[PDB]
Design a protein around this ligand. Structure first.
Ligand SMILES: O=C(O)CN(CCN(CC(=O)O)Cc1ccccc1O)Cc1ccccc1O
Ligand SMILES: [O-][O-]
Ligand SMILES: [Fe+3]
Length: 498
């Protein structure tokens, strides 16, 4: 039993179709399925299912030499034919992958032999290898498990090459994984992992206290943060808090009054004491964010000027813009029209609600009336996709997505970022520059383009950065130190070594 663990997740892991999205969970897809090349903490990739590769001078044709010793968990061989059929299955559903620019860049994939796989691109797409390293969609299920030679309409058994095999799933109850005893790589120390489905954060904390589970691993929403801090003092428990992995921010709608006004967005960015918000709502556990990406993010150390909390400046900006207070009202008006902004968030998420309430209070102190619109998850996602918001909570994606993939996606109209930016006079230039940066191999030009994109987004006050958040862990001491994965969305269960 010291090599079996029980943990929790807010939902089931899903069917583990490697090539689809929700309800599939990206950490579980990564437990079962593997990439050609593996992302590393330093930003590089290493050989994985591909032992080596070459590329043409024009950077458009890539030939991977694959391992010849890998089997799917069902004993069938992994080879270049299997890899090629996976790429075909993914790209047969190309439109669904529009958010990921590699899916638009791949022109052809063919197996040249059992060990040679050739991928041709439209352009010299620089993030090629890092996008092949992602949890999805470019990982490999045994082609025997395709349905009518596709995966977009479903799969049979979720058969990968990875260190874990799905043993069984029970909807709304649990998922159980076991170690792959015929894995090509290192044997995990842990033999079995049970995921209890526990959607509520308090209930997760109770499950840990009672001993029903052994491990909690997740972001700032993992469990109540006051409880987390108590646990970190409890000598019967082990806890961890990682260095930050991504940004939580508001997106402001540049295409909707009154956030269409630069002066309004600038004022909002001076109105929030972020340290106080963190100490009040997140129990002092997270770090203040002054920019869309932390200065530690690749290409993002740009000396952008923070808008430090300064309500006097926020009021001055609003006054100068014609938003003044009517006697004897606390909410500003500009031609009888009140400064009113709707903030939408997931209504059942206690932490989001508490942050929304702080933001509403702080803005009220500078004469802006923020209306809280708490709705179900699906309604909030619908608002993001169609721009039906004034301000909306948002977050970046962590390594290896930040910044290149997050920026790439700003071009997709059915995403919150495009919608928030839609009102900017320079939106077409930004989208043009995002396209250029991804295909640049002139490193000087690449840095220049990232600087221009990020500086415009900063100077135009498109976002209200709030915090750089961390991964957190609560565990039974016997499990030992719990590692973090290079990819923020992954959970490195095969590295746990009690
Ligand atoms: O899904 C992935 O593989 C990675 N996701 C790619 C884009 N999604 C595509 C999608 O989910 O359909 C749609 C989407 C848009 C805006 C915010 C989040 C978001 O998921 C991004 C993503 C990265 C890290 C963690 C969670 C994530 O959702
Ligand atoms: O995609 O979450
Ligand atoms: Fe996604």
């Amino acid at each position: 039993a010291p090599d079996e663990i029980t943990t929790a997740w807010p939902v089931n892991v899903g069917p583990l179709n490697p090539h689809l999205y929700t309800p599939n969970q990206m950490f579980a897809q990564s437990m079962v399925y593997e990439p050609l090349v593996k992302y590393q903490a330093d930003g590089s990739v290493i050989p994985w299912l591909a032992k080596s590769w070459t590329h043409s001078e024009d950077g458009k044709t890539w030939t991977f030499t694959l391992r010849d010793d890998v089997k799917f968990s069902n004993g069938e061989p992994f080879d270049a034919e299997a890899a090629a059929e996976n790429f075909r299955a993914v790209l047969d559903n190309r439109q669904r992958h529009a958010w990921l620019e590699l899916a638009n860049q791949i022109v052809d994939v063919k197996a040249l032999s059992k060990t040679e796989l050739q991928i041709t691109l439209k352009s010299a797409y620089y993030p090629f290898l890092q996008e092949l390293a992602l949890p999805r969609p470019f990982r490999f299920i045994a082609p025997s498990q395709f349905k009518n030679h596709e995966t977009m309409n479903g799969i049979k058994a979720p058969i990968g090459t990875g260190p874990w095999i799905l043993q069984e799933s029970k909807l709304n109850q649990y998922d159980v994984f076991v170690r792959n005893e015929n894995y090509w790589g290192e044997k995990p120390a842990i033999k079995k992992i049970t995921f209890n489905v526990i959607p509520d954060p308090t209930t997760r904390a109770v499950a840990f206290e009672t001993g029903d589970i052994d491990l909690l691993y997740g972001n700032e929403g993992l469990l109540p943060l006051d409880t987390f801090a108590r646990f970190s003092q409890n000598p019967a428990y082990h806890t961890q808090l990682s260095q930050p992995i991504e940004t939580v921010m508001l997106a402001l709608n540049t295409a909707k009054a009154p956030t269409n006004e630069l002066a309004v967005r600038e004022a909002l960015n001076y109105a929030v004491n972020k340290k106080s918000l963190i100490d009040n709502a997140l129990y002092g556990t997270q770090q203040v964010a002054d920019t869309l990406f932390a200065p530690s993010v690749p290409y993002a150390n740009l000396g952008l000027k923070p808008s430090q909390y300064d309500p006097q400046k926020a009021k001055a900006l609003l006054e100068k813009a014609g938003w003044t207070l009517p006697a004897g009202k606390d909410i500003r008006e500009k031609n009888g029209q009140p400064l009113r902004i709707e903030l939408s968030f997931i209504g059942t998420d206690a932490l989001s609600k508490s942050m929304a309430e702080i933001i509403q209070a702080d803005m009220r102190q500078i004469g802006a009336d923020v209306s809280l619109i708490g709705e179900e998850e699906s309604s909030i996602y619908a608002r993001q996709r169609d721009g039906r918001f004034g301000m909306i909570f948002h977050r970046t994606w962590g390594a290896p997505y930040d910044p290149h993939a997050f920026l790439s996606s700003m071009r997709v109209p059915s995403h919150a970022d495009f919608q928030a930016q839609q009102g900017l006079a320079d939106k077409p230039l930004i989208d043009k520059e995002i396209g250029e940066v991804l295909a640049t191999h002139d490193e000087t030009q690449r840095q220049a383009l990232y600087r221009d994109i990020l500086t415009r987004l900063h100077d135009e006050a498109v976002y209200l950065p709030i915090s750089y958040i961390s991964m957190m862990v609560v565990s039974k001491p016997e499990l030992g130190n719990i590692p973090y994965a290079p990819i923020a969305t992954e959970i490195p269960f095969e590295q746990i070594k009690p």
